[PDB]
């Protein structure tokens, strides 16, 4: 990236030797603008390298809009379908590990995602995966039966996300109606093991898919568990 000199303002000399200067930079930076005061300011304090940053809110004129971070390669769902077969098992695990880092920060700050999926996960420079936007195929039994949301209901969605990643962007419960999904999941049916997913990785998905929400592990526990798989093989 080349920067035009006129965009920069030099204010003070900070460190001598080249010469380091405190300066200001006015630039037209690429952003993602979501179109429609208090709930918008609590989202701004939430900063993490694995979460899509909210830069600000435009309120002076209608429609009001939120200014988010721009991710160079768009949503993960399409990214996996487009570049199918090009990914290694480690790269796919590393994608789940990036999402888990962000979700561990969100659960620590007591924030429920309510729609965690590959479509809401974005790919940036050097294949960084970040979580954004904070569907019975991603919904846990307590969400489609009692509408009870928690970090444990997000853990079920993370299990479906992991599956989506290892199946390389495949649609979960394909050629199955919403009602058919609900009855089968409740019976004990789960998404099959994707070829690229290890036997142990599939067990973690099934741990995320435990009918009892408290039986499911936390994102803090999933982060340790997944990183351990990345170190061993
Ligand atoms: C490379 N392909 C995947 C297609 C390129 C696609 C695009 C670009 C221009 C016109 C049409 C399609 N593309 C999209 C992005 N970026 C984003 O989609 C994006 N980048 N940052 C985002 C933040 C949110 C967001 C929603 N709620 N909170 C944040 C939602 C979406 C985004 C990068 N390339």
Swiss-Prot record:
Ranges for domain Protein kinase: 8-229
Its biological purpose: Tyrosine kinase that plays an essential role in regulation of the adaptive immune response. Regulates the development, function and differentiation of conventional T-cells and nonconventional NKT-cells. When antigen presenting cells (APC) activate T-cell receptor (TCR), a series of phosphorylation lead to the recruitment of ITK to the cell membrane, in the vicinity of the stimulated TCR receptor, where it is phosphorylated by LCK. Phosphorylation leads to ITK autophosphorylation and full activation.
Outcome reported for the amino acid change (mutating residue 84 to Q): In a gastric adenocarcinoma sample; somatic mutation
UniProt protein name: Tyrosine-protein kinase ITK/TSK
Gene that encodes the chain: ITK
Modified residues (Phosphoserine): 179
Tissue localization of expression: T-cell lines and natural killer cell lines.
Active site: 115
Notes on the domains: The N-terminal PH domain allows ITK to be recruited to the plasma membrane by an activated PI3 kinase. This domain also contains a proline-rich region (PRR). The adjoining domain is a SH3 domain, which binds to PRR (from itself or from other proteins). Next, a SH2 domain is required for binding tyrosine-phosphorylated substrates. In the C-terminal region, the kinase domain is required for tyrosine phosphorylation.
Family, similarity comment: Belongs to the protein kinase superfamily. Tyr protein kinase family. TEC subfamily.
Subcellular location: Cytoplasm; Nucleus
Disease listed for this protein: Lymphoproliferative syndrome 1: A rare immunodeficiency characterized by extreme susceptibility to infection with Epstein-Barr virus (EBV). Inadequate immune response to EBV can have a fatal outcome. Clinical features include splenomegaly, lymphadenopathy, anemia, thrombocytopenia, pancytopenia, recurrent infections. There is an increased risk for lymphoma.
Record's comment on post-translational modification: Ubiquitinated.
UniProt subunit comment: Homooligomerizes; this association negatively regulates kinase activity. Interacts with PPIA/CYPA; this interaction regulates TCR signal strength via a proline-directed conformational switch in ITK. Interacts with THEMIS. Interacts with FASLG. Interacts with VAV1; this interaction is important for VAV1 localization and TCR-induced actin polarization. Interacts with TBX21.
Covered residues, full protein: 357 to 619 of 620
Gene source species: Homo sapiens (Human)
């Amino acid at each position: 990236s080349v920067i035009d000199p006129s965009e920069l303002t030099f204010v003070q000399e900070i460190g001598s030797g080249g010469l380091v200067h405190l300066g200001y930079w006015l630039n037209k930076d690429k952003v993602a603008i979501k179109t429609i005061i208090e709930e918008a300011e609590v989202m701004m304090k939430l900063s993490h390298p694995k979460l899509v940053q909210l830069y600000g809110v435009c309120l002076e004129q209608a429609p009001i809009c939120l200014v988010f971070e721009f991710m160079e390669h768009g949503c993960l769902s399409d990214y996996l379908r487009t570049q199918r077969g090009l990914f290694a098992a480690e790269t796919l695990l590393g994608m789940c590990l990036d999402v888990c880092e962000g979700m561990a920060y969100l659960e620590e700050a007591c924030v429920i995602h309510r729609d965690l999926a590959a479509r809401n996960c974005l790919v940036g420079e050097n294949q960084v995966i970040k979580v954004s936007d904070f569907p019975v195929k991603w919904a846990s039994p307590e969400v489609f039966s009692f509408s009870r949301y928690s970090s444990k209901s997000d853990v079920w969605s993370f299990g479906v996300l992991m599956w989506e990643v290892f199946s390389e962007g495949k649609i979960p419960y394909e050629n199955r109606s919403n009602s058919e999904v609900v009855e089968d999941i409740s019976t004990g049916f789960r998404l099959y093991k994707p070829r690229l997913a290890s036997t142990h990785v599939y067990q973690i998905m099934n741990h995320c898919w435990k009918e009892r929400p408290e039986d499911r592990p936390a994102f803090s526990r999933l982060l340790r568990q997944l990183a351990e798989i990345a170190e061993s093989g």
